Design a protein around this ligand. Structure first.
Ligand SMILES: CC(=O)N[C@@H]1[C@@H](O[C@@H]2O[C@@H](C)[C@@H](O)[C@@H](O)[C@@H]2O)[C@H](O[C@@H]2O[C@H](CO)[C@H](O)[C@H](O)[C@H]2O[C@@H]2O[C@@H](C)[C@@H](O)[C@@H](O)[C@@H]2O)[C@@H](CO)O[C@@H]1O
Ligand SMILES: [Zn+2]
Ligand SMILES: [Zn+2]
Ligand SMILES: [Zn+2]
Ligand SMILES: [Zn+2]
Lengths: 222, 219, 219, 216
């Protein structure tokens, strides 16, 4: 089966370099042109680079010419993107793509790798529980969650019960605070008569600050 | 030089409805080889885009035949003959003929369904956070439609302003509803200067604003 | 938001009793006839009982009539199912269900709570790493996984990286072993050249025994 | 005891084709109130069934219009206009007109696609498992089609029998393929008694049987 996986993304200061790798499997690598496409937060897609299967033919949009260099290793099914002189603007998700022999551009994509270029300092989040109470209850529905506050930069991954809990879950889009830090909340509703019928734990991952925290949420208040 | 303009920015439509998204190229986008590599992509949040249409009208394998594409010159269109809940996403056109390659700004496709009133919940700050020197009060609006909703914060009846942030989820892929959160943030000092916190929710599914509240201490 | 959550299922000895619970929300429970439906391992669906919203009108199929009892507490939106004189044949997943005012029987369901009638005792699984190696590598692809061996009863859930990893993932159905214990294997393929770039962790969950294991798989 | 019989028990069609499933009741199923409560359900492994059609031809809110239902008397049919990879599931018909309410036996629905050779990987017993006193060797067949496949174990060239078990995943909702695992189980002492282990895979997409192995 066709697979693509990017890595190397990270948080970097303006002027530094970052090297992205795209490992592929499931097809004949040396047979296709490879692509790099990125997506700035809240923005659209933007083609970033392409390279011939063989011949070293390359090209890029004007915004990265001279700073970015795509390259490959037809021996290790790997595509590379050397990124020199990064700028805040280069912040976004970087995807690896591959087209089809009959005129397709991005038929298969990797999962994506996050890159942030900032002079601001990385910061892990605090995880406070949104305890279910009678104020968290309504039409027989109890509500509980976790608050992921003051962190930088994107992104933060949130899950409940290591993935075992997904129904009724709402993980809100992050929102940038005036402080310059991001914040988001993940919640879940359940019938009131439940609660205690199981435990609830949020799993908070924030790779840039090496944060992996699990926070059990339990009833209280009125 | 060759700009790609999609229309509309966003459009909402009922289940089963017909849908048309258009994309206009500044110049003629027909490759020197004769073809017109105009493509159409579908993308959901936190996920990679998926290819639906290439070469103007070729449907990528595994793509439901209800999706189609046509056009030429400078006007191209993406079509969905029978909209379905799972189609709520953002759609982008792409021009691969004349370099440099560009994407359209995209179109958000929402579903139109019956008005659903939101359930409202409020959470006082956690003790751990209070020790931090700050307090966050969270008001949650669960599974409702339309998206428009006015959430207001009132402290001891004093209507708040400029000290809270809202966040809305993507329109649910099954029941077509939205959920929302409003976070009022204050320092511990100012938070402990008041008794009752409340968020008043005004939505089309509510006859009168629903207010959920608590007293710093106990009910 | 209509939600239904069953609970109470466990391993019970033949002849003994078990009482299942069904907590609901999102609708006027008192206005609806409730239902229980079960599904024995590898079998089809089977209606188990129904109860009127009011009036205590109840009925069941001949297979459980006399042993099972459905009841409800309209004050706490809770449907119950008392199961007496259980037989191995009663093993299976039990679902809570609710219809619609205009005619359907099972419009909304619960996640289902597992019931296993056996003289055997619960048994957590041992989790062993299926490390990616030159032997686990093939067409540019590398394979890794986790072996969830010797547990009882069904079922076992598996996630990778807390649910964040889903591409290339295959969690096989469990297999009963001659020892009488079930064994399960969950795998994922990744391009070999990426080995050493990502962390792989299988989050195994065997609720019937409250056993949780998050084994890290290293090349 | 109104019995419900569906046909066929399972059928495969190409992504796009139109498919139909029939359900026949051993007696008329018209409720005393005049309604005919014949419903259709769709279920996939480990999940709760989803209502699709009720009262013969009523599409439950949220169900795709490519699904429909029809019929009367003792014969009913469920139809999918343009089959898709995500319709890979089991479909049962239900009757609530006469108590006791009864379900049909169910019909499995697969996707017909082009043949696809399987990737084969083998996993020796883990060190930490051997300290357990047992040894499990796992063989993996990834993304293949059709489902038919032969997996044979060989210990020092001796073909094994009665000491392996295989499991097969549901037809993938994407590329419509299958994956399989064959697990060979031996005790630590017995396992340490041999050198070469291997699984032989024979599948339609393979020009000839493929073998993967190791010896330690
Ligand atoms: C919202 C509610 O609970 N309504 C009940 C109604 O049940 C509904 O309609 C029936 C047909 C079924 O689809 C239910 O799942 C749905 O909630 C009750 O109807 C009875 O339901 C039981 C349970 O299956 C039996 O099927 C019984 O035969 C039904 O009564 C018949 O249908 C009614 C609509 C009336 O015509 C009645 O005279 C028939 O005998 C009724 C109780 O009758 O109560 C609420 O309306
Ligand atoms: Zn919700
Ligand atoms: Zn104040
Ligand atoms: Zn696979
Ligand atoms: Zn031997």
């Amino acid at each position: 089966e066709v697979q693509l996986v990017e890595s190397g993304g990270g948080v970097v200061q303006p002027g530094r370099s970052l090297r992205l790798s795209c490992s592929t499997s499931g097809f004949t690598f040396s047979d296709y042109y490879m692509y790099w496409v990125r997506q700035a937060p809240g923005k659209g897609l933007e083609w970033v680079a392409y390279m011939s299967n063989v011949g070293a033919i390359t090209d890029y949009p004007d915004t990265v010419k001279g700073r970015f260099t795509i390259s490959r290793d037809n021996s290790k099914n790997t595509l590379f993107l050397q990124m020199d002189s990064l700028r805040p603007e280069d912040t976004g998700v970087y995807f690896c793509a591959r087209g089809t022999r009959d005129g397709s551009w991005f038929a298969y994509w990797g999962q994506g790798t996050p890159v942030t270029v900032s002079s601001a300092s990385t910061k892990g989040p605090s995880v406070f529980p949104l305890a279910p109470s009678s104020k968290s209850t309504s039409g027989g529905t109890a509500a509980l969650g976790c608050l992921v506050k003051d962190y930088f930069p994107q992104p933060v991954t949130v899950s409940w019960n290591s993935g075992a809990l997904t129904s009724g879950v709402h993980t809100f889009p992050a929102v940038l605070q005036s402080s310059g830090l991001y914040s988001l909340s993940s919640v879940v509703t359940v019938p009131s008569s439940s609660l205690g019928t199981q435990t609830y734990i949020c799993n908070v991952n924030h790779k840039p600050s090496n944060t992996k925290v699990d926070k059990k949420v339990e009833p209280k208040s009125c | 030089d060759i700009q790609m303009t999609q229309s509309p920015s966003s459009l909402s439509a009922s289940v089963g409805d017909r849908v048309t998204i258009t994309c206009r190229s500044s110049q003629r986008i027909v490759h020197s080889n004769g073809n017109t590599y105009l493509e159409w992509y579908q993308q959901t949040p936190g996920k990679a885009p998926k290819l639906l249409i290439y070469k103007v009208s070729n449907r990528f394998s595994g793509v439901p035949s209800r999706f189609s594409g046509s056009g030429s010159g400078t006007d191209f269109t993406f079509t969905i003959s029978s909209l379905q809940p799972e189609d709520i996403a953002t759609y982008y056109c792409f021009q691969g003929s004349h370099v440099p390659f560009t994407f359209g700004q995209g179109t958000k496709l929402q579903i139109t369904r019956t008005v659903a009133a939101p359930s409202v919940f409020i959470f006082p700050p956690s003790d751990e956070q209070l020790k931090s020197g700050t307090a966050s009060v969270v008001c949650l609006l669960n599974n409702f439609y339309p998206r428009e909703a006015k959430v207001q914060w009132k402290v001891d009846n004093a209507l708040q302003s400029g000290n809270s942030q809202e966040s809305v989820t993507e329109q649910d892929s099954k029941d077509s509803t939205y959920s929302l959160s409003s976070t009022l943030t204050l320092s511990k000092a100012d938070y402990e200067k008041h008794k009752v916190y409340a968020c008043e929710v005004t939505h089309q599914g509510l006859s009168s604003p629903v207010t959920k509240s608590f007293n710093r201490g106990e009910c």
